[PDB]
DNA sequence: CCGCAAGGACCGCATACTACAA
């Protein structure tokens, strides 16, 4: 597995799906980067390097597989079963009622990010709570710009716009290369355009598997699956897929989640927006009670568009 | 020829203290 590290020179824009044309709708608000955007940046580099075989021009997916992405300062969205109570974010474990897994009422969820070490303790079921100071928020930087007339140096009519950028220190991407020679091509490049407004990020590439993908969790009936990237597909099909890949049937499951992630994007091949897809948002947790004990995998890919970085679930246990 | 050999008042007050288009 190859590990790509993107270091933004300054700011990044991963624009939400909304009109953003000069002289009209003029507000661009960034979201947390979707893995397909990172995949697109890599595919575009290969598209220009002449490796159009691995790109998948006009195709939904490339030949290579983007395992997933993570932002860094490496941090992850607070699991949705972690609820803020006073100055602490408390882990809420599944309960049972009428023979069904439920999450007991303990307050509303508040968004935020935690370090990889805090997530690791969570996945091992050893995390009780997190002090509110260790819960990170992503910094935004709002910039307001204009367009000037060529000669008179005054603002052209209606040419004012606003961008809410993200201030991100690092983005990590992991790629499985079936022999396209991506590691060599990425090594030849120092930087690439990532997201909107022609912002660039420095590129480093190392041949390594992150330790979080190599954890030994043991065997249990009570496994959980933390989605680190958006996961596309019906919950039923995802659970069924999970049953097949682990060769074990499920007694019951509970999806703790939030607002669905709206995913469209821009088709650079056809020069028009991509079709809207809906996904289980990062930070969502699928609690599963298998009928038999399973060896909980450190990570597992689920749902549609796996090669674009979607459906990266991190294994964990609960009691 | 000798001696003395500064002191307090005031102590920045007021007004203006964004306007407008692109
Ligand atoms: Mg632009």
From Swiss-Prot:
The keyword Nucleotide-binding applies. One of its GO terms (biological process) is defense response to virus. It is found in: Cytoplasm. One of its GO terms (cellular component) is cytoplasm. Its main location: cytoplasm. It comes from the Archaea. Pfam families: Cas_Cmr3. Changing residue 197 to Q: Still cleaves target RNA when assembled in the Cmr complex. Keywords: Antiviral defense, Cytoplasm, Nucleotide-binding, RNA-binding. One of its GO terms (molecular function) is RNA binding. Part of the type III-B Cmr ribonucleoprotein (RNP) complex, an elongated RNP with Cmr2 and Cmr3 as the base, with Cmr4 and Cmr5 forming a helical core along the mature crRNA (39 or 45 nt in length), while the complex is capped by Cmr6 and Cmr1. The 5' end of the crRNA is bound to Cmr2 and Cmr3, while Cmr6 and a Cmr1 subunit (Cmr1-1 or Cmr1-2) cap the 3' end of the crRNA. CRISPR (clustered regularly interspaced short palindromic repeat), is an adaptive immune system that provides protection against mobile genetic elements (viruses, transposable elements and conjugative plasmids). CRISPR clusters contain sequences complementary to antecedent mobile elements and target invading nucleic acids. CRISPR clusters are transcribed and processed into CRISPR RNA (crRNA), formerly called psiRNA (prokaryotic silencing) in this organism. Belongs to the CRISPR system Cmr3 family. This is CRISPR system Cmr subunit Cmr3.
């Amino acid at each position: 597995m190859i590990e790509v590290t993107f270091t933004p020179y300054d700011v990044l824009l991963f624009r939400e799906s909304r009109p953003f044309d000069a002289g009209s709708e003029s507000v661009a608000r960034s979201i947390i980067p979707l893995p397909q955007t990172v995949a697109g940046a890599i595919r575009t580099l290969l598209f220009y390097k002449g490796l159009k075989n691995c790109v998948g021009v006009g195709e939904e997916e490339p030949e290579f597989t983007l395992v997933g992405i993570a932002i860094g300062t490496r941090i992850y969205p607070l699991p949705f079963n972690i609820i803020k109570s006073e100055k602490f974010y408390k882990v809420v474990n599944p309960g049972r009622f009428l023979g069904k897994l439920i999450l007991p009422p303990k307050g509303k969820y508040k968004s935020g990010y935690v370090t990889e070490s805090i997530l690791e303790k969570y996945l091992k079921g050893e995390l009780k709570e997190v002090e509110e100071n260790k819960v990170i928020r992503i910094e935004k930087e709002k910039r307001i710009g204009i367009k000037l007339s060529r000669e008179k140096k005054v603002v052209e009519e209606g040419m004012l716009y606003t961008v809410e950028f993200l201030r991100i220190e690092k983005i990590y991407a992991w790629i499985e290369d079936p022999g396209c020679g991506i590691k060599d091509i990425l090594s030849s490049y120092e930087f690439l355009t990532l997201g909107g407004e022609s912002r660039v990020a420095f590129v480093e590439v190392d041949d390594k598997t992150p330790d979080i993908f190599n954890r030994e969790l043991g065997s249990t009936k009570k496994a959980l699956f933390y989605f680190s990237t958006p996961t596309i597909g019906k919950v039923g099909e995802i659970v069924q897929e999970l049953e097949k890949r682990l060769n074990a049937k499920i007694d019951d499951y509970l999806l703790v989640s939030s607002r669905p992630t709206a995913i469209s994007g821009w088709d650079m091949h056809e020069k028009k927006p991509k079709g809207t897809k809906f996904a289980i948002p990062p930070g969502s947790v699928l609690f599963v009670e298998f009928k038999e004990e399973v060896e909980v995998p450190p990570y597992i890919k689920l749902g549609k568009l796996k090669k674009l970085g979607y459906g990266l679930a991190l294994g964990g246990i609960w009691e």
